């Protein structure tokens, strides 16, 4: 009656864009990147070593001054480090210890966290009295919550495992938008440098671009064979890297609507727990789970480095705003703060 | 400096407060509570008192945390590593669903919707050494059911004997036959009674026996 009415219509829809994506696909990225130099041996040393977490570390986020950083561990502590002198500024205790994400406000006044308790609490750092206190709990998601990201002091986008991403107004405390196109569990978020779009990855093996003011799903990209675990934006704001459980990273261009470069090696067939980019967009840093991070080069697709100082698997990593550092938390309760040495 | 010497003073005031909450958090028992749906999980938490419903029921000199993941309508492969370090796993199965098929896809009589689950939980890589408490929930409810129909609808390879106390030799051993890694974890088993102690005292003394076999493996002997 009507089941194959729009099913066979849907076969017209994708086939209108499947070969159209191949139509503007004139040459391989690994054939026009032969012109440039390789990056070289990226040997990086754990300068500081932030110890003090007592369980697995599930997310960390750098402040905007490239000096403070917040790390959220699975024993239910949020800890703000002075990453210069390896000392604690604040240690925020959490109402539910099942944290899967954390974020730093770009003004520094606020930190948020959420996880398996389905709420993204935000915390006021710089207040009149001495302590950090919680400002608003943003309830309204029905899945587990996997990424909080602040747009400014009053708007924060959260993705969740009820297949929905949302936009919020923290002053009022309720969703101004909801972004529903995903079919599987949404695992990642990456706000744009202009903060006008974002991309979010899901367990349907597809990632999608959104608009924060419109509310509709702007683009949709396939290419992976299992769950997407991490998305960050390129420093363009015009590209993103998806790290998946298929042991691969892949790089999409939003204006080109399809993937360009795939980062894999035959000797590694475990997942990719976190992704971040560097200041040039020349170093893709990706925290795998054969217990070490791999520093991929985004233009050549080789393993440019290894950061092998971690006991258990690398669950999070973030690179600064100016490119000066990269922390990696992991499931063995340390943050190795790396830096390249002359 | 001189203001930095009061930053460092404040930071090891933080450090001696992390390491006082983290020694009072390795002294508490964490138990993932699982189940296949209508499994009597509400019955067990009634004895011991939108995402995690973290229940604390500390009763005999021993702090207890029980994490009901009941409402998570999402992929369990994506948040089950959060419970890797955990003491036990209290798995519930109602025994009065042995001829009760599911209305999902004319599925088998809900024990193949529990042996479906138990074989996935017991052979999961985060729970290779996580010893699993088993509960058989409806004891005096399927004694009425076994008279009306035997356990041949569920498994037609059973012996017979048509008795309430036969079904342990049918059903209970059929779950512990799915325990592939038999060296590392020891499936405990019980029959969930309405008595005050014997459903919560059993979780107490069979988590002492996880604790002791954790220390003996950690202190070299076992």
């Amino acid at each position, epitope marked *: 009656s009507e089941l194959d009415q729009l099913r066979q219509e849907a076969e017209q829809l994708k086939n209108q864009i499947r070969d159209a994506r191949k139509a503007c696909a004139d040459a391989t990225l690994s054939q026009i990147t032969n012109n440039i130099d390789p990056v070289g041996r990226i040997q990086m040393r754990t300068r500081r070593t932030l110890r003090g977490h007592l369980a697995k570390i599930y997310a960390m986020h750098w402040g905007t001054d490239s000096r403070l950083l917040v790390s959220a561990s699975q024993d239910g502590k949020l800890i703000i480090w002075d990453s210069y002198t390896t000392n604690k500024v604040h240690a925020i205790p959490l109402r539910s210890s099942w944290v899967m994400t954390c974020a730093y406000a770009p003004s520094g006044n606020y930190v948020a966290c959420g996880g398996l308790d389905n709420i993204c609490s935000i915390y006021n750092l710089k207040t*009149r009295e*001495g302590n950090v206190r919680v400002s608003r709990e943003l309830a309204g998601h029905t899945g587990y919550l996997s990424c909080c990201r602040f747009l400014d002091d009053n708007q924060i986008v959260t993705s969740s495992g009820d297949t929905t991403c949302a936009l919020w107004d923290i002053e009022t405390g309720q969703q101004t938008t909801t972004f529903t196109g995903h079919t599987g569990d949404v695992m990642s978020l990456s706000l744009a440098p202009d903060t006008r779009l974002f991309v979010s990855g899901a367990c349907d093996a597809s990632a999608k671009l959104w608009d924060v003011r419109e509310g509709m799903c702007r683009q949709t990209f396939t290419g992976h064979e299992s769950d997407i675990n991490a998305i960050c934006f390129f420093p363009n704001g015009n590209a993103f890297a998806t790290g998946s459980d298929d042991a691969t990273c892949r790089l999409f261009d939003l204006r080109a609507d399809q993937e360009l470069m795939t980062y894999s090696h035959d000797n590694i067939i475990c997942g990719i727990t976190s992704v971040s980019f560097s200041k040039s967009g020349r170093l893709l840093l990706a925290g795998y789970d054969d217990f070490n991070c791999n520093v991929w080069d985004a233009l050549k697709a080789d393993r440019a480095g290894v950061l092998a100082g971690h006991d258990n698997r690398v669950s999070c990593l973030g690179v600064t705003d100016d490119g000066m550092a990269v922390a990696t938390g992991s499931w063995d309760s340390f943050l190795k703060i790396w830096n390249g040495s002359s | *400096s*001189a*203001e930095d*010497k009061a930053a460092v*003073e404040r930071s090891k005031m933080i450090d001696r407060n992390l390491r006082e909450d983290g020694e009072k958090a390795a002294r508490e028992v964490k138990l993932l509570l699982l189940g296949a749906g209508e499994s009597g999980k509400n019955t067990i938490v009634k004895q011991m008192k939108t995402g995690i419903v973290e229940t604390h029921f500390t009763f005999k000199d021993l702090h207890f945390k029980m994490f009901d993941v009941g409402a998570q309508r999402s992929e369990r492969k994506k948040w089950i590593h959060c419970f890797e370090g955990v003491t036990a796993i209290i798995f519930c199965v109602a025994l009065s669903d042995y001829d009760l098929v599911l209305a999902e896809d004319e599925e088998m009589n809900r024990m193949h919707e529990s042996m479906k689950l138990f074989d996935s939980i017991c052979n999961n890589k985060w729970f290779t050494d996580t010893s699993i408490i088993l509960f058989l929930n409806k004891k005096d409810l399927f004694e009425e059911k076994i008279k009306k129909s035997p356990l041949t609808i569920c498994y037609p390879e059973y012996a017979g004997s048509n008795t309430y106390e036969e079904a342990a030799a049918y059903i209970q051993c059929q779950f512990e036959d799915l325990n592939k890694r038999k060296d590392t974890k020891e499936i405990y088993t019980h029959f969930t009674c309405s008595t005050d102690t014997k459903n919560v005292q059993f979780v107490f003394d069979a988590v002492t026996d996880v604790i002791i076999k954790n220390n003996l493996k950690d202190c070299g002997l076992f």
Partner: single-chain antibody
Amino acid sequence: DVQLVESGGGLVQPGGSRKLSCSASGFAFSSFGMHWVRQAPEKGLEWVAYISSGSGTIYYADTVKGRFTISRDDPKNTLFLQMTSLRSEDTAMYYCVRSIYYYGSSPFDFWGQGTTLTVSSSDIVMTQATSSVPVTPGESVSISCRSSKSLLHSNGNTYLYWFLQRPGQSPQLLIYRMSNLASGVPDRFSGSGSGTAFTLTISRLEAEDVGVYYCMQHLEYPLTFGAGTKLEL
């Protein structure tokens, strides 16, 4: 919100002893380092003591070292000071000042209302050569003071602390660490300088920016104020 009201004293003979107490309310008292700062009649500010957060570090002033003792009580939220064998030089109004030190904090922001105590009958000095400026509102005024040492430390920051004591009032933090503006201050005030010479540049005066404009250092102990630059209108 914050309130630090202290008490105790009013007339104690020389050779006697008087205990001061500063009762705190409205803030997380056990996170803050406390101080005491005294102020003689018709004279300037001068530092007395210190207790760090959690009673770890205690510094004193060399005029009172051994005669004075400082004690905090974190469950009761009350700062003490016990003073022995009182001299006539110990005639001052005593202020209870809070302070917190982590990365980026503004110490010395909230000052208490003050308690007078009268009796009957090597380190850096800060120099404010100016003692009186009679002006009119609406125009820019730069207050400047000088240091013995280079206040720029090797980590990067320069510990000079500007203050303002309105007539009949308590001091308040204008510019902490020589450059940054505190909480509750208007944006008209600003501080700058390099190394040894600094300047506090108000761009447009008001009828309430008139008062004595002190400068303190915090590079090393003791903490030393100079005599203030009095403004008139």
